[PDB]
Amino acid sequence: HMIQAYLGLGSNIGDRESQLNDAIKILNEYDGISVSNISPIYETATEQPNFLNLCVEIQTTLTVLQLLECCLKTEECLHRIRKERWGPRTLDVDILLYGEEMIDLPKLSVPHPRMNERAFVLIPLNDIAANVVEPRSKLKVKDLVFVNDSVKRY
Numbered sequence: 234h235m236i237q238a239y240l241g242l243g244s245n246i247g248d249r250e251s252q253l254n255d256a257i258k259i260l261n262e263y264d265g266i267s268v269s270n271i272s273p274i275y276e277t278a279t280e281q282p283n284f285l286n287l288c289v290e291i292q293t294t295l296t297v298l299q300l301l302e303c304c305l306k307t308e309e310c311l312h313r314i315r316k317e318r319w320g321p322r323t324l325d326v327d328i329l330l331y332g333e334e335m336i337d338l339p340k341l342s343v344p345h346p347r348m349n350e351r352a353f354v355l356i357p358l359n360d361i362a363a364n365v366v367e368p369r370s371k372l373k374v375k376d377l378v379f380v381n382d383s384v385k386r387y
């Protein structure tokens with residue numbers, strides 16, 4: 234049946250905003266995934282560009298492992314098609330939450346085990362998932378989010 238999940242997307246190279254918008258486009262077009270909500274974008278502040286990050290709410294009929302493959306194929310797709318002969322990767326797609334489930338595999342940890350210490354994740358996530366419970370801490374997102382001045386709305 235249909236599960237609600239949250240993804241975190243980040244990019245700090247090229248047309249960063251396009252990367253993010255293209256990742257969302259691709260994800261929305263996999264079978265078993267539809268994008269139901271999108272956070273605003275945030276910028277986070279040595280000489281390489283700042284990250285843009287956002288969070289995405291999806292409704293999916295996929296298993297969390299199938300969802301992981303979709304995320305990685307999306308990273309892979311955008312990367313392969315980059316102009317620049319080599320360089321740092323263009324896009325990170327991380328699974329933040331999958332229902333209220335906890336998953337501990339070598340290849341997969343959900344909830345993302347570092348989300349709670351990252352404002353560039355929590356702040357955008359709080360814009361679309363304030364009342365969702367993070368099952369490890371058993372706190373809601375809105376109870377975890379904190380102010381961080383280095384994270385600005387873009």
Ligand SMILES: Nc1ncnc2c1ncn2[C@@H]1O[C@H](COP(=O)(O)CP(=O)(O)OP(=O)(O)O)[C@@H](O)[C@H]1O
Nearest residue numbers: 325326327328329339340341342343344345346347
């Ligand atoms: N919640 C999650 N979302 C996505 N990948 C995860 C994950 N938990 C574990 N992984 C695994 O970690 C591997 C690492 O890929 P990367 O994207 O380069 C880690 P990262 O996002 O750069 O750092 P981070 O995990 O601290 O954000 C993936 O191939 C995947 O199998």
Ligand SMILES: [Mg+2]
Nearest residue numbers: 243325326327
């Ligand atoms: Mg990451």
Ligand SMILES: [Mg+2]
Nearest residue numbers: 325326327328
């Ligand atoms: Mg990752």
